[PDB]
Amino acid sequence: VPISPIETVPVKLKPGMDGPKVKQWPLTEEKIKALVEICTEMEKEGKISKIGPENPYNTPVFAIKKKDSTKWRKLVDFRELNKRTQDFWEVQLGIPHPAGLKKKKSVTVLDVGDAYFSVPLDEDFRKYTAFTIPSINNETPGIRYQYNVLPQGWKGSPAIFQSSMTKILEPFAAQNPDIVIYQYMDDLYVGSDLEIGQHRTKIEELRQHLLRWGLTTPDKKHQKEPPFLWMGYELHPDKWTVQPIVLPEKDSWTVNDIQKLVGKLNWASQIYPGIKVRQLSKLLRGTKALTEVIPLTEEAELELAENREILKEPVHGVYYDPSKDLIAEIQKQGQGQWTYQIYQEPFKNLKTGKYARMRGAHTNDVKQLTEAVQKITTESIVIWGKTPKFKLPIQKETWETWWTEYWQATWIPEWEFVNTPPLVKLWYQLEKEPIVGAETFYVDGAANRETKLGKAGYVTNKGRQKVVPLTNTTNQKTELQAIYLALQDSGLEVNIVTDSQYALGIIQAQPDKSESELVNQIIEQLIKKEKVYLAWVPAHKGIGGNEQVDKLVSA
Amino acid sequence: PISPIETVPVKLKPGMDGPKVKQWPLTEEKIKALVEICTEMEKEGKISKIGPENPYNTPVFAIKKKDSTKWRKLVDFRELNKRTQDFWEVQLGIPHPAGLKKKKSVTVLDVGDAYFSVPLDEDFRKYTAFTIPSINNETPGIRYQYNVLPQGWKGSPAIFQSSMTKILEPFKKQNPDIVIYQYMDDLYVGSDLEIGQHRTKIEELRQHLLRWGLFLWMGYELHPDKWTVQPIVLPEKDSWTVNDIQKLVGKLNWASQIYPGIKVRQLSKLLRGTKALTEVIPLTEEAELELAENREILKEPVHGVYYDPSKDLIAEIQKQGQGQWTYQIYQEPFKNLKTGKYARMRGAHTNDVKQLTEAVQKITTESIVIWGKTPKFKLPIQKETWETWWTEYWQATWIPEWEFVNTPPLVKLWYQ
Numbered sequence: 001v002p003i004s005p006i007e008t009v010p011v012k013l014k015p016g017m018d019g020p021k022v023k024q025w026p027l028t029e030e031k032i033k034a035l036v037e038i039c040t041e042m043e044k045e046g047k048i049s050k051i052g053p054e055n056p057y058n059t060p061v062f063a064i065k066k067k068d069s070t071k072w073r074k075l076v077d078f079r080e081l082n083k084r085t086q087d088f089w090e091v092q093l094g095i096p097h098p099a100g101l102k103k104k105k106s107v108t109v110l111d112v113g114d115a116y117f118s119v120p121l122d123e124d125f126r127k128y129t130a131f132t133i134p135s136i137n138n139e140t141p142g143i144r145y146q147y148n149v150l151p152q153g154w155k156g157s158p159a160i161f162q163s164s165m166t167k168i169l170e171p172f173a174a175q176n177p178d179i180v181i182y183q184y185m186d187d188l189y190v191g192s193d194l195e196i197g198q199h200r201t202k203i204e205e206l207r208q209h210l211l212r213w214g215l216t217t218p219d220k221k222h223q224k225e226p227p228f229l230w231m232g233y234e235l236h237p238d239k240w241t242v243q244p245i246v247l248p249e250k251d252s253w254t255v256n257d258i259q260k261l262v263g264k265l266n267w268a269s270q271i272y273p274g275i276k277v278r279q280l281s282k283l284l285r286g287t288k289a290l291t292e293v294i295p296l297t298e299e300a301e302l303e304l305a306e307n308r309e310i311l312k313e314p315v316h317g318v319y320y321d322p323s324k325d326l327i328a329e330i331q332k333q334g335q336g337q338w339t340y341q342i343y344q345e346p347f348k349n350l351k352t353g354k355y356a357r358m359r360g361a362h363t364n365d366v367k368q369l370t371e372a373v374q375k376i377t378t379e380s381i382v383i384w385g386k387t388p389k390f391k392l393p394i395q396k397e398t399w400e401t402w403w404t405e406y407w408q409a410t411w412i413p414e415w416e417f418v419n420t421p422p423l424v425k426l427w428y429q430l431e432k433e434p435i436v437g438a439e440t441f442y443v444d445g446a447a448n449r450e451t452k453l454g455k456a457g458y459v460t461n462k463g464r465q466k467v468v469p470l471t472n473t474t475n476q477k478t479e480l481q482a483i484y485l486a487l488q489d490s491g492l493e494v495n496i497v498t499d500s501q502y503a504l505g506i507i508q509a510q511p512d513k514s515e516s517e518l519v520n521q522i523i524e525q526l527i528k529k530e531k532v533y534l535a536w537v538p539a540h541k542g543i544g545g546n547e548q549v550d551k552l553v554s555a
Numbered sequence: 556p557i558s559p560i561e562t563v564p565v566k567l568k569p570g571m572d573g574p575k576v577k578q579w580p581l582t583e584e585k586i587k588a589l590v591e592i593c594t595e596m597e598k599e600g601k602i603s604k605i606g607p608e609n610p611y612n613t614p615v616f617a618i619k620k621k622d623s624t625k626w627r628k629l630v631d632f633r634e635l636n637k638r639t640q641d642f643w644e645v646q647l648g649i650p651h652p653a654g655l656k657k658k659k660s661v662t663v664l665d666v667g668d669a670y671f672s673v674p675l676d677e678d679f680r681k682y683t684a685f686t687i688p689s690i691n692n693e694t695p696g697i698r699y700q701y702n703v704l705p706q707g708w709k710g711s712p713a714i715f716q717s718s719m720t721k722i723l724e725p726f727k728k729q730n731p732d733i734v735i736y737q738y739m740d741d742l743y744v745g746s747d748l749e750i751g752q753h754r755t756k757i758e759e760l761r762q763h764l765l766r767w768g769l770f771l772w773m774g775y776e777l778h779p780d781k782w783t784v785q786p787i788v789l790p791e792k793d794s795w796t797v798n799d800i801q802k803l804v805g806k807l808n809w810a811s812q813i814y815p816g817i818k819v820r821q822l823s824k825l826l827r828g829t830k831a832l833t834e835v836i837p838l839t840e841e842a843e844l845e846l847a848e849n850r851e852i853l854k855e856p857v858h859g860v861y862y863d864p865s866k867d868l869i870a871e872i873q874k875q876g877q878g879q880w881t882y883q884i885y886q887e888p889f890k891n892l893k894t895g896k897y898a899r900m901r902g903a904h905t906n907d908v909k910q911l912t913e914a915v916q917k918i919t920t921e922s923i924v925i926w927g928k929t930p931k932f933k934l935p936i937q938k939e940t941w942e943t944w945w946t947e948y949w950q951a952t953w954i955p956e957w958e959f960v961n962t963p964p965l966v967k968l969w970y971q
């Protein structure tokens with residue numbers, strides 16, 4: 001019969017600050033009757049206790065009557081006490097992901113919400129939860145009260161509640177390896193793969209173990225139906241999915257009309273293959289006010305239409321099985337978009353997703369795939385505790401040629417080539433040594449800082465030359481225009497000498513798509529060529545050719 | 556039976572708060588190894604569980620040293636360290652032994668376990684908080700706290716500095732010329748002997764430290780060699796092509812920022828005029844005289860280049876290809892205090908990130924031996940890639956600071 005206590009957790013207010021000193025709000029006659037009634041039973045139970053005039057601390061108190069519901073409930077306002085309490089280790093950061101669960105033959109739910117108050121508070125802190133109950137017509141002193149348990153709405157109540165619930169369950173979960181118990185607020189989820197008879201048997205051992213500390217649970221009835229709804233998901237005995245994602249059939253799409261459809265499509269994207277949100281996010285990436293009817297690009301209409309074909313036929317994801325291997329497949333969608341499906345068995349996806357390129361000036365496919373892969377590796381470690389084996393759209397030879405020559409250290413975990421629709425590849429490859437028999441083009445460009453007038457040209461070893469005038473340009477643009485002129489007038493194999501550190505940087509990164517049409521034109525030219533050798537020489541010193549063109553492009 | 560009856564008073568830096576660094580995801584095998592390790596440290600009372608009133612947190616993970624395949628627990632105390640009162644012992648901080656880098660042979664010893672025999676200051680134990688993560692946020696994280704001196708902390712070596720001194724007198728009084736230095740959980744022993752009588756002399760210091768109440772069986776052997784700063788050389792050919800001279804002028808034009816006396820006028824003259832890149836250009840009288848004068852300037856040392864203890868060290872690393880890497884250490888641009896070329900080794904020649912990570916570790920070690928402190932690195936890899944793999948190949952008990960360079964250096968070869 002003797003129940004053992006629940007160790008108290010020493011608490012403290014922020015260093016240098018004091019307790020709260022807020023005034024009480026003048027309540028109406030009816031309300032006061034409610035509060036007095038409430039505070040009466042609560043004092044009986046143990047929840048609170050009356051205090052003398054010593055306690056200088058006071059916290060506002062209200063009472064609200066839930067519309068179309070009998071009786072009321074007090075609501076203490078700890079807004080101020082919270083801003084003066086220390087910090088706690090919030091272990092309530094993020095929840096599990098369905099796809100990481102493993103099916104169970106039986107699964108029960110216990111409601112431990114009733115034990116949120118059976119958890120004592122720190123003695124030397126109770127004096128901070130003081131509050132006053134104004135009396136009728138204020139012709140008497142209001143009744144004072146202080147808490148002896150975890151207040152509903154205090155900063156560290158959840159934190160203290162969870163830590164204590166754990167310590168108690170610890171011994172049990174240790175001596176019952178055949179059962180699993182997830183803890184999350186007012187609900188305890190227990191499950192196990194065994195006889196439906198023996199399951200409800202061990203459930204009682206739990207209910208009874210919780211008894212040894214006093215904690216009691218409301219056990220009776222049966223809330224069974226596969227349509228388990230939890231944190232936005234829809235769990236079933238052996239599959240899951242997102243709650244019905246309804247695509248607003250509206251005509252006038254304001255800011256929140258799309259922005260609330262962005263966060264909503266991203267949610268659905270963890271299981272429906274193909275969702276796209278690029279053309280949509282690019283419509284409110286920089287808009288004014290919270291809402292505003294903004295016209296949708298023609299591109300944000302053809303994908304949103306492919307959303308109603310993907311979001312047409314409900315799709316379901318399975319559950320994780322430790323024994324089978326874990327595979328990951330990636331696909332290239334375009335405009336810097338990629339999709340991935342993770343699974344163990346063909347067509348039985350555990351989950352799915354997308355990757356968006358990082359906003360940059362230049363970029364290439366291989367760099368993006370790596371980024372997408374590192375992102376899937378980290379997500380899998382989080383959900384399954386291990387790195388999946390990859391199936392990618394890139395030949396083994398293409399990868400080796402790349403890593404061995406990239407100026408950076410790079411790496412991809414174990415993987416295999418999959419011959420699907422498109423194929424990531426290298427568009428062009430620069431030589432390491434000059435080409436014998438190829439014409440040599442000495443290029444140069446330059447602009448006037450004020451007039452914005454520049455020239456871009458070149459001279460070769462065969463006597464060919466050219467200089468073109470430009471208006472409204474910088475030095476950087478002129479140096480690129482010059483590389484381009486050479487690439488257009490040269491044959492299949494060519495040697496190019498420049499003094500532009502700026503140009504060399506753009507090209508040694510080996511981009512295959514860019515924001516600047518000038519860089520894109522260069523790419524197109526590099527692709528048609530068979531061998532291009534790009535060499536650099538210091539500026540404003542006698543290198544010649546670069547020194548001769550440099551003169552023609554100046555003044 | 557070594558255990559101080561008292562503890563040394565420790566506090567954080569004037570007006571600074573404890574660490575609150577987030578713990579990153581770990582693989583399921585690493586989780587099981589940390590659970591086993593921590594289950595035993597708790598019984599040995601080295602650590603203890605803590606409640607939620609503790610908001611402080613420091614990262615933590617699992618590696619494996621050189622020999623032993625058994626898991627080891629490494630705690631990242633970087634944040635805690637810079638916030639920790641730079642211990643200013645009343646007896647000063649051992650003036651770094653400038654004799655360590657001149658010694659022909661140095662050996663590194665892991666006397667980490669000697670720290671766990673000394674209690675930590677009660678009012679600080681809450682700053683060493685760390686969590687053992689759980690897969691899929693299924694269960695709440697196991698939380699702990701250190702009771703002894705934590706390996707990886709910048710204070711553990713200093714606090715233990717007093718006991719360490721006398722544990723070494725019966726050896727330091729015997730062998731005068733031997734130089735001993737300490738950093739973190741490492742002990743560095745240099746000498747001028749030979750591998751025969753150097754390797755055995757270490758076994759002597761091993762049993763000796765074993766009789767004073769003390770992974771206590773590892774050691775790494777290294778030899779600080781020639782050229783603190785490698786010279787810069789110019790090709791020596793008999794026939795030059797326009798391309799060859801074009802790269803020469805580029806290299807000299809770069810060296811000149813280092814050595815002001817270099818001249819490239821007479822060499823640029825051969826270049827005036829648009830000529831094919833693979834054509835041979837005869838050197839002129841003046842050309843060869845200048846190439847001769849420049850070659851001499853490069854033989855001599857750089858202008859007065861000194862080390863400033865107040866400022867911090869920078870470390871650049873270039874990827875040369877085929878398992879080769881180059882590097883330089885410095886405080887001021889164009890005033891290297893050290894340059895080198897870490898070559899191929901166990902990188903399987905297929906893993907770029909494993910090599911880089913071994914290079915970083917190797918350059919750090921050397922750095923501790925010359926100036927007694929680690930350098931700030933500028934790694935040639937995307938931040939994302941590095942943060943995803945580094946830990947799978949790390950083996951040192953300390954961790955340096957680092958940043959990422961995203962612009963391809965124009966000099967990927969003048970350092971070759």
Ligand SMILES: COc1c(C)cc(/C(=C\CCCc2nnc(C)o2)c2cc(C)c3oc(=O)n(C)c3c2)cc1C(=O)SC
Binds near residue numbers: 190
């Ligand atoms: C059996 O597969 C499961 C299914 C299908 C559903 C759930 C439920 C929530 C999942 C979130 C809790 C969690 N996180 N990690 C873990 C671990 O569990 C859930 C939810 C509600 C509202 C329920 O109302 C009910 O009456 N039941 C029975 C409910 C069950 C758990 C599992 C398990 O495997 S756990 C034992």
